[PDB]
Design a protein around this ligand. Sequence first.
Ligand code: CHL
Ligand code: CHL
Ligand code: CLA
Ligand code: CLA
Ligand code: CLA
Ligand code: NEX
Ligand code: LUT
Ligand code: LUT
Ligand code: LUT
Lengths: 219, 219, 219
Amino acid sequence: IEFYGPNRAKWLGPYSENATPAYLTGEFPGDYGWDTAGLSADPETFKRYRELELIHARWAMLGALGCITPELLAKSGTQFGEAVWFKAGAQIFSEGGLDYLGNPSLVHAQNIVATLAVQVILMGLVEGYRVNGGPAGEGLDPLYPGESFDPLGLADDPDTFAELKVKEIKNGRLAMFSMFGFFVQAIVTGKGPIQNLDDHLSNPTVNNAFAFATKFTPS
Amino acid sequence: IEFYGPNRAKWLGPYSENATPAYLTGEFPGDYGWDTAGLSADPETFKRYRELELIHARWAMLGALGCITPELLAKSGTQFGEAVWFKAGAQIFSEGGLDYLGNPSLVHAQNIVATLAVQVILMGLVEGYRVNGGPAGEGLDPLYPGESFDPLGLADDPDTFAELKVKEIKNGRLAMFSMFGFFVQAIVTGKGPIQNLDDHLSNPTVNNAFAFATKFTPS
Amino acid sequence: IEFYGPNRAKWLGPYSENATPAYLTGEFPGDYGWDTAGLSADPETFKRYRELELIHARWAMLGALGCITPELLAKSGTQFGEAVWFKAGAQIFSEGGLDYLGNPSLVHAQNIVATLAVQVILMGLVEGYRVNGGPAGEGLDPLYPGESFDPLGLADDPDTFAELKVKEIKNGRLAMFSMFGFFVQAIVTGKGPIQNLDDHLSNPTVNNAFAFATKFTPS
Ligand code: CHL
Ligand code: CHL
Ligand code: CLA
Ligand code: CLA
Ligand code: CLA
Ligand SMILES: CC(=C/C=C/C(C)=C/C=C/C=C(C)/C=C/C=C(\C)C=C=C1C(C)(C)C[C@H](O)C[C@@]1(C)O)/C=C/[C@@]12O[C@]1(C)C[C@@H](O)CC2(C)C
Ligand SMILES: CC1=C[C@H](O)CC(C)(C)[C@H]1/C=C/C(C)=C/C=C/C(C)=C/C=C/C=C(C)/C=C/C=C(C)/C=C/C1=C(C)C[C@H](O)CC1(C)C
Ligand SMILES: CC1=C[C@H](O)CC(C)(C)[C@H]1/C=C/C(C)=C/C=C/C(C)=C/C=C/C=C(C)/C=C/C=C(C)/C=C/C1=C(C)C[C@H](O)CC1(C)C
Ligand SMILES: CC1=C[C@H](O)CC(C)(C)[C@H]1/C=C/C(C)=C/C=C/C(C)=C/C=C/C=C(C)/C=C/C=C(C)/C=C/C1=C(C)C[C@H](O)CC1(C)C
């Protein structure tokens, strides 16, 4: 319970090998000291890796929640068409464009190339202004700004804020691994991941993983 | 990102010809140094042009939003009759006067000459009191007053206020150019501009502009 | 028109953001300052990237001309069999080995493992002697030697030689991007790229790209 210090929860716990690599000793969230290959020895490259991992973690968390929500919403009391995240990308082609919420009173996007061009414009703008700053105050911090992106004001107390940093990083790692699980389930079985959840909760041991283990057999 | 200074985003960027005309060097929003004819060499006439351009920009922005909103509102979930801005001016003549929102429980203006006379009276009053001041404090500034027209109080911090000035001017220029586009679409094809939007999004390249290029052919 | 200097044609030209990364300011061809990720901050690794990009550029230019020539030659007045670069690699297996120019009086390579072994021997020799030098004078420059590889003598005048450097790098970048296009056309449509050229020149807009956009649809 001492991540910011030498007594952090190390990568093997009581198999910790307390001779840790000296280029990271606490002082940054998520430092669990698991460097078996050591691709981040250089400090500026290490900083790039911190920024890159933060970006990956936030994007992956957003995608993971986006993979949990719509299927459950369409399973509970709404209808989307194909709420499973495979053909949600092809819902614009099928019959009447991509109707949001499965309702012909919402977005109803007919042409995907318009989404394409506007998306490129907006994403270029937001990513450029993410790197170099811009609106809502010029960006002075590349890792965590501290400017008007926290309209509630939770970043006053420092140690709870650092605990929030560590929770953010751990949640992002879990989100990245879980989205890898989503992608592998997309490959192997190619069905709904929450359909997978229901089917495994209905079938705990008879259809576990290895009925789907003789599919990609070369011959 | 330095509009208020010699390092403003000039009219050609890195084709800037940094020998700019010396009668404008920053210190005013929208100064992009593009004076190829030079019709504003005199300083008082230049001030007139700043005031005139501000008036044109605000009026054109109002008109542009007025050209985007009603068609979308009548396309989504309401009905107006002719929501396209052509015969919206003739909606008072058709059958039952100009019913607002397409509802016979709202304005229901029967005689257009009454709108005419009251509009002249009100417009004369508001423009005279715009020039020379009057209510809500006497007008001491012709460009931006600073009196009780900003009930929220966003004009405290000066540099963000200047950035707001520049955004206002750029939005006004875009609005003027876009309303010119609206007028040219009114002339050439004479159909709904958002109907144009939907048709070009449905037809990106087969009906682009030059099917409507052999209409005004003299003979 | 000033690549060797601060006034180079930067990556956005008129959106240049003249605060360029300081680890490259001219003095080398192809320096267009477009470092959004920054994977070449280290100077020796940057040198490796210059050498590597030169090798890639020359190899890709050779491959690109090798992808333009034979199809056109077999389309104009000669015959090769499959002049399209797909089965040109399998022309040794088909009936009578790989006959050069489509003529049974030229190379007529029967066994591909002989080409294989001789190719490995020759390529190991030339690549080793490329790295460490050797014949025709020992290699003293890893980037551009200056020894007897320019039997015409165009490297006397320095500024024209530097312009040749920049042309070489730009041609190489274009060749790499174009060969990527060749590979993507090999994947998606799997037909002749110059057959693609003729078909798009015959069909400019009816078969553009998105008839070939519903092929790799998962289900
Ligand atoms: C449109 C312009 C645009 C521009 C200029 C940038 C620019 C940038 N982005 Mg951004 N992005 C843009 C659009 C978008 N980005 C993202 C998502 C991200 C993420 C998630 C991240 C960035 C990052 C970055 C930075 C460097 C990334 C890089 O080197 O890419 C090179 C990479 C590729 C060309 C593709 C790499 C694919 C990857 C290997 C996936 C491999 C998949 C797995 C192996 C598993 C696959 C399936 C499963 C089942 C096994 C750079 C500033 C990174 C960053 O800021 O780090 C500090 C970062 O982490 N961008 C999305 C969402 C789709 C965009 C949509 O338009
Ligand atoms: C036979 C022995 C042989 C030896 C010892 C070398 C040795 C060397 N070569 Mg050479 N080569 C040899 C044969 C050949 N080379 C080349 C072509 C090249 C090129 C083009 C380059 C070198 C380079 C190098 C140097 C380091 C490259 C490396 O790290 O590879 C690791 C790489 C791989 C194992 C394969 C990488 C594949 C790559 C990722 C392709 C990805 C494809 C795209 C994503 C797109 C694909 C399809 C499209 C449609 C999307 C190294 C001195 C590089 C250099 O000198 O840089 C300064 C360099 O740029 N070699 C060819 C032509 C096929 C050879 C044929 O025999
Ligand atoms: C691309 C995503 C990515 C990136 C850049 C990083 C980056 C980093 N991680 Mg990290 N991590 C990730 C995903 C990622 N992580 C995921 C998904 C998990 C959960 C499994 C973890 C769990 C983890 C732990 C437990 C620790 C780190 C640590 C680190 C730091 C040092 C290690 C390093 O140099 O990594 C460089 C990484 C790369 C260059 C990415 C290479 C990716 C290629 C494609 C190979 C991946 C193949 C993979 C092994 C096959 C199975 C995939 C499956 C497991 C998902 C560095 C900031 C250590 C640290 O000190 O934290 C700050 C540490 O203790 N990570
Ligand atoms: C009538 C509207 C109007 C007026 C009075 C001004 C006034 C001004 N603009 Mg301006 N501008 C406008 C509309 C207008 N603008 C629009 C719509 C755009 C976008 C295309 C711009 C883009 C623009 C830039 C990029 C710059 C200016 C600048 C200036 C200032 C110096 C130039 C000058 O003396 O203009 C005098 C203008 C007139 C006397 C108007 C004459 C109008 C007649 C009918 C001719 C128009 C015909 C037209 C060319 C045909 C195509 C129309 C189509 C492009 C819409 C001055 C304050 C410069 C500056 O320093 O900013 C402060 C500068 O750098 N403007
Ligand atoms: C592998 C090929 C390769 C390599 C090693 C380089 C290397 C370099 N380029 Mg470069 N470039 C290339 C291909 C390549 N280029 C191509 C094909 C284009 C045309 C699109 C360009 C256009 C370009 C510009 C405009 C600029 C550079 C610059 C640079 C330098 C700094 C950037 C850097 O660190 O790159 C490191 C690169 C790599 C480590 C390669 C990673 C490759 C992986 C597979 C990711 C690629 C995925 C790709 C984005 C997906 C779409 C591919 C499609 C666009 C082809 C460096 C010497 C900058 C400079 O200063 O020039 C000297 C600069 O301004 N390049
Ligand atoms: C109206 C008109 C305009 C011409 C436009 C041109 C010439 C565009 C070419 C435009 C071509 C241009 C600009 C190319 C210019 C090349 C340059 C600058 C070279 C360069 C570079 C860079 C950037 C690498 C930078 C490097 O560091 C230095 C340097 C020097 O290497 C033509 C009309 C006619 O063609 C018709 C219509 C019908 C005919 O019958 C009659 C006529 C009159 C001839
Ligand atoms: C550390 C280390 C160390 C040692 O030394 C070495 C090694 C081992 C190599 C290393 C490792 C590495 C790794 C593992 C990595 C991984 C990563 C990942 C997983 C990522 C993900 C990542 C991921 C991510 C980002 C994701 C993202 C996502 C997204 C956006 C999504 C989207 C979406 C959504 C919403 C929904 C819809 O409907 C669809 C989609 C489209 C689906
Ligand atoms: C700068 C310069 C420089 C150089 O040197 C020379 C030159 C070139 C000459 C110059 C230029 C100029 C120009 C271009 C100008 C333009 C302008 C414009 C466009 C305006 C508009 C302008 C415009 C405007 C105001 C507008 C306004 C509008 C409005 C009110 C509207 C109204 C409406 C609405 C609401 C709706 C309904 O249903 C109808 C209507 C009725 C429709
Ligand atoms: C710069 C940067 C920056 C930022 O920061 C980040 C990023 C974006 C990542 C980066 C980028 C990168 C990139 C893009 C790369 C690319 C590359 C390429 C494309 C290469 C090619 C490359 C390519 C190449 C070499 C090629 C080569 C080729 C060859 C040999 C060929 C051969 C051949 C021939 C003759 C013909 C026959 O019949 C067949 C064949 C076999 C076909």
